[PDB]
Design a binder for this molecule. Structure first.
Ligand code: CL
Ligand code: NA
Length: 129
C-alpha cells in the first residue's frame, strides 16, 4: 500500500503515535516519507547484511524475524514479512517499542539526518484537525 501523506497521518494518529514519548505526529509522517516513501511493502538491505522492512524501515537484527540475519533478537515477536502489510498495527506496536528503548527517534537514521531540526508540521499540512 502506497499511502497518501494525509492518509498516513490519520492512520498514525488513530494508533496514538501523536506525542508518543514526546514526538509530534509530524515527526512520524516525516520519518516514513523518507524511510520508505510511504510504501508498506518497502525493503532495503543493509551492509551488515540486515534488512529494513515496512513503512518505517524496521530492522531485522534487532527487531523482527527474517530467517537470514545472524545473530536476530526478534525483540518485537514477529515475522519481518508481517510488517509489509497494508495495515500498519504491527509496525506502529513495534515502532512504539523502538522509540522507547534509549535513543528516541534517533533510531531512525533518516529521521536524524532529514527530520530532526526541521518544522515537521509541514508534514501534516492540509490534514483533517
Ligand atoms: Cl526520546
Ligand atoms: Na531480530
Amino acid at each position: 500500500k502506497v499511502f497518501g501523506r494525509c492518509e498516513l497521518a490519520a492512520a498514525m494518529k488513530r494508533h496514538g503515535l501523536d506525542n508518543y514519548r514526546g514526538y509530534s505526529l509530524g515527526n512520524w509522517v516525516c520519518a516514513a516519507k523518507f524511510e520508505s516513501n510511504f510504501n508498506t511493502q518497502a525493503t532495503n538491505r543493509n551492509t551488515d547484511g540486515s534488512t529494513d522492512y515496512g513503512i518505517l524501515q524496521i530492522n531485522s537484527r534487532w527487531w523482527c524475524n527474517d530467517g537470514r540475519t545472524p545473530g536476530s533478537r526478534n525483540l518485537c515477536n514477529i515475522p519481518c514479512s508481517a510488517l509489509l502489510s497494508s495495515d500498519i498495527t504491527a509496525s506502529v506496536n513495534c515502532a512504539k517499542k523502538i522509540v522507547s528503548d534509549g535513543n528516541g527517534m534517533n533510531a531512525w537514521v533518516a529521521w536524524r539526518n532529514r527530520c530532526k531540526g526541521t518544522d515537521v508540521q509541514a508534514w501534516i499540512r492540509g490534514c483533517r484537525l
